[model samples]
Target: PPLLLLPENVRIRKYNTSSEKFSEYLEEEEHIQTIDYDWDPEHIGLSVVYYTVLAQGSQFGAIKRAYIPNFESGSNNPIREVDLGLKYLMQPDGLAVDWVGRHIYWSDAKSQRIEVATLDGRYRKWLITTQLDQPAAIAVNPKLGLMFWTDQGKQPKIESAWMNGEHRSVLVSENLGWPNGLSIDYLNDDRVYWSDSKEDVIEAIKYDGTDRRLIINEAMKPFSLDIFEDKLYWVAKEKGEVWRQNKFGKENKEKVLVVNPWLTQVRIFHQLRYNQSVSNPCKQVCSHLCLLRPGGYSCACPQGSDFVTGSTVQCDAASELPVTMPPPCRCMHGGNCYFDENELPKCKCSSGYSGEYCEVG
Candidate 1:
């Protein structure tokens, strides 16, 4: 699916801050802010300043293949543009000055801070600031403020800090000089991916600052990133517009904007994933959380291992990373999870196996 849809030449209704939360099956945007992700092959648009002539693409090119739902139909695929004059807003050296959800977030590279506002450009608020050294675009963990970004000026390393601008730390700092773009599966807070503009590479690291993994090492300098439904969205300046890939952080299917070559100043982009999960504390208002359960207790269904029932087990959970269950049970053959009736665990693994004993194969 295309990361963002820019329906060329269309007028959309003002996307108000969404308050609806699904009672049964919340859409992927549940993990996103207000905007939900719906693979819009028709939602093709430029920027909030669509009417303005800031962007380069117009005549269209190969990007036409990555058609947004209404790209040609002039249909406004339900989205929010929190602020109106974002196009005129100081782009301040970023690729995603564009995005999908009604809410858009970005780090002020020059200001060394982060901010989030509505898509049409409203409800603007400062997220955090710790003299971020030329910070780039990335996801902000709603609670932890894991404001991920890249260092462009001095060392060109990949780093992040709490959203409040506290506990600033580095993820990758050596070899790949000046990594530009960054995207986090904040939904799961499991790993982070970033682009090395100078080295033409992409890398991933566990959010707790571990398991530094590489996605790609040879490519163009991708500047900014927006993650939708586990999909990584990024833009390359002087190359074209935008492109998106998957979890392994490997391949990109659509180069969304190939026509606009002089693509610079593409500041920030936001996207909502429908399949992803979201949570609502209240009926009217809700928040997206995909990284709730990762740590805690887990079962030992290691490769080729069988779940031995009547052998329920509990393991140590880590506070540093999200835990899946409080106890790691043995689900024979790696299956679903379930505790005793009312005494069952507060959290259980998805249906596939069962038993705290995990002895049932």
Candidate 2:
């Protein structure tokens, strides 16, 4: 089931891929800014929760969860909606679910923070709070114990980190303009795709920041994107339409649906949307963050903490120390130094400057 958010009246519409039919799933008076869902494959009742971050009207930025009808049985049970104990969120623009972890993560642009909480809205924690500006569209790959998000700030870029906000690094900092929607191709090459409305393009790159490729170069303000099977779907903000293209090539582009220009996000809610065969990699490894890599897993500490000496999985809180002046900026000619996906520092040169450390200006 591919879900579309019609923000004009704050309604969620479901499109049945098999029958090619559209049905209204839920509606709300408040504007829904972003949405994600979690479906348990093993649950006897086929329990699923669609989480949405609402903005405007009475809620004014509240995270709400809606228990939707069964996908297979089409149960007539009344939808159950509950507020997740949060309100007045300042620009809650992105929401994602860690299905394996049974948690929800969201980004608040105004607050410049990424936060996480359990499915029941308990055990909340601020996951990432530093080096963020206008964070939007977030996606998680729980099978890999990783999450990715886009920051469309003064320095527009896409970044990835562990679920616990460790080993954070910049994946795409160049050739980005108003980087908006983000989604992971978890089943295939595990690449992260994004839409840059300001640039009118859709691009994808591997999780390690390699093989960056442009998929659609003529998109009209592509806002939010999601990949289901072999097709990549996106909402065109200015065109008031949804477009789909083959995830590997740009030749098969086609408009799938037309909606009011207020459409903001789209997601797929199929039972096999995620790989269920792979067990949670962090289930028994890390004390804090269990990060998955090619053929292996690594442990990491969360913010304000460090790994215990001689241990890769144990973590201890760092003792507070007096604030001190930081090291000098290595980037020349106004360039900024940022860590790459490999955790190596690199310079993001300013306009008119280029090279390693911006030395070739």
Estimate, for each residue in 200-229, the C-alpha lDDT of model 2 and write its tens digit: 888888878898888778877888888887
Cα error, candidate 2, residue 257 (Å) = 1.5
Candidate 1 regions with alpha-carbon error over 4 angstroms: 1-3, 6-90, 94-104, 116-127, 143-145, 186-189, 225-236, 241-246, 249-257, 264-277, 280-361
lDDT of 2: 0.68
Task: Highest lDDT: give the candidate number.
Answer: 2
lDDT of each: 0.41, 0.68
Give the per-residue lDDT digits (tens) of candidate 1, residues 42-129. 2323222221211223421100001122121222122222214433222233322222233345555556756554433333445555
Deviation in angstroms for 24 in model 1? 34
What's the alpha carbon RMSD for model 2? Answer: 19.6
Mark the 10 consecutive residues where model 2 has the least summed lDDT.
Answer: 320-329
RMSD of each: 19.3, 19.6
